[PDB]
């Protein structure tokens, strides 16, 4: 039985309402729950879903150099594969292998409906509406390291805006957009931004083109006997139209807006 690490992040993995009456994999539902079943079928393995102990994706402490999250669970042997919306990045790929992406995404803008902002350039050319990102992570780093004039102007503003425009969690970023009466715009992954829009009170919108391009991938340890098959399975499901189908199902068929 393959041990699958994953993360409770909607709509990827969520507890079914009647989870206490159930056990094992049946306790969960979501895009990644459906994906794990397809990947297992196509690779021929039995598996057990487990939620990542510390509830994190995967980052390496700059001082201690220890890996936390799902990446940590793979490099320290606690799980055999990670099936979740784990972004394919250079630092992670140095230590684990990623399948080809199963979903595309990029940095985007979340506004409270009615905010007169349509792009990153709009935001950079004004100060009435504050804007920020998660206070740690790649989105913040994107701006910090960018050489593009608009993005550098945005970084300059954000780094010294008061009150602080950075938030501790994704949920706080969403709540701040919702409760700031149009005076705060949040930068985050387009997939989450698209998902919010679609969730009641239906008061947020995704605007502008993505500012970068990335992808989520299934992760396995270096030398894993699972890597090759998992990678072919993702390509097959994309070509059969199944990945698009799952995305449409969890974002729109189950949408409320
Ligand atoms: O560092 C990460 N950060 C992530 C933040 C996310 N917010 O909404 N979804 O879905 C997310 C997926 C993420 N995946 C990552 O690997």
Curated annotation (Swiss-Prot):
Question: Hey, what tissues is this thing expressed in?
Answer: Detected in forebrain. Detected in dendrites of neuronal cells. Expressed in the pyramidal cell layers of CA1 and CA3 and in the granule cell layer of the dentate gyrus.
Q: Which GO terms describe its biological process?
A: cellular response to amine stimulus; cellular response to brain-derived neurotrophic factor stimulus; cellular response to glycine; cerebral cortex development; chemical synaptic transmission; conditioned place preference; establishment of protein localization; ionotropic glutamate receptor signaling pathway
- UniProt entry keywords in alphabetical sequence: Cell membrane, Disulfide bond, Glycoprotein, Ion channel, Ion transport, Ligand-gated ion channel, Lipoprotein, Membrane, Palmitate, Phosphoprotein, Postsynaptic cell membrane, Receptor, Signal, Synapse, Transmembrane, Transmembrane helix, Transport, Ubl conjugation
Site Crucial to convey clamshell closure to channel opening: give positions.
Answer: 117
- A GO molecular-function annotation: extracellular ligand-gated monoatomic ion channel activity
- Induction (record text): Down-regulated in the pyramidal cell layer of CA1 in the hippocampus by global ischemia.
Residues given in the record as L-glutamate binding sites? 85, 87, 92, 138-139, 189
Q: How is it modified after translation?
A: Palmitoylated. Depalmitoylated upon L-glutamate stimulation. Ubiquitinated by RNF167, leading to its degradation.
User: Which residue ranges are assigned to the Extracellular compartment in the record's topology?
Assistant: 116-257
Q: Where in the cell is it found?
A: Cell membrane; Postsynaptic cell membrane; Postsynaptic density membrane
Task: Report which superkingdom the organism of origin falls in.
Answer: Eukaryota
Tell me where in this chain the PTM Phosphoserine is found.
146, 180
Q: Where is this site: Interaction with the cone snail toxin Con-ikot-ikot?
A: 60, 144, 236
* Bridged cysteine pairs (disulfide): 202-257
The role this protein plays is: Ionotropic glutamate receptor that functions as a ligand-gated cation channel, gated by L-glutamate and glutamatergic agonists such as alpha-amino-3-hydroxy-5-methyl-4-isoxazolepropionic acid (AMPA), quisqualic acid, and kainic acid. L-glutamate acts as an excitatory neurotransmitter at many synapses in the central nervous system and plays an important role in fast excitatory synaptic transmission.
What family does the entry list? Belongs to the glutamate-gated ion channel (TC 1.A.10.1) family. GRIA2 subfamily.
Kindly state the subunit structure of this protein: Homotetramer or heterotetramer of pore-forming glutamate receptor subunits. Tetramers may be formed by the dimerization of dimers. May interact with MPP4. Forms a ternary complex with GRIP1 and CSPG4. Interacts with ATAD1 in an ATP-dependent manner. ATAD1-catalyzed ATP hydrolysis disrupts binding to ATAD1 and to GRIP1 and leads to AMPAR complex disassembly. Interacts with GRIP2. Interacts with GRIP1. Interacts with NSF via its C-terminus. Interacts with CACNG2, PICK1 and GRIP2. Interacts with GRIA1 and SYNDIG1. Part of a complex containing GRIA2, NSF and NAPA and/or NAPB.
Miscellaneous comment in the UniProt entry for this protein: The postsynaptic actions of L-glutamate are mediated by a variety of receptors that are named according to their selective agonists. This receptor binds AMPA (quisqualate) > L-glutamate > kainate.
Q: What is known of its domains?
A: The M4 transmembrane segment mediates tetramerization and is required for cell surface expression.
Q: What is this protein called?
A: Glutamate receptor 2
Q: What is the lineage of its organism?
A: Eukaryota, Metazoa, Chordata, Craniata, Vertebrata
- Gene (name only): Gria2
Residues of the whole record sequence present: 415 to 794 of 883
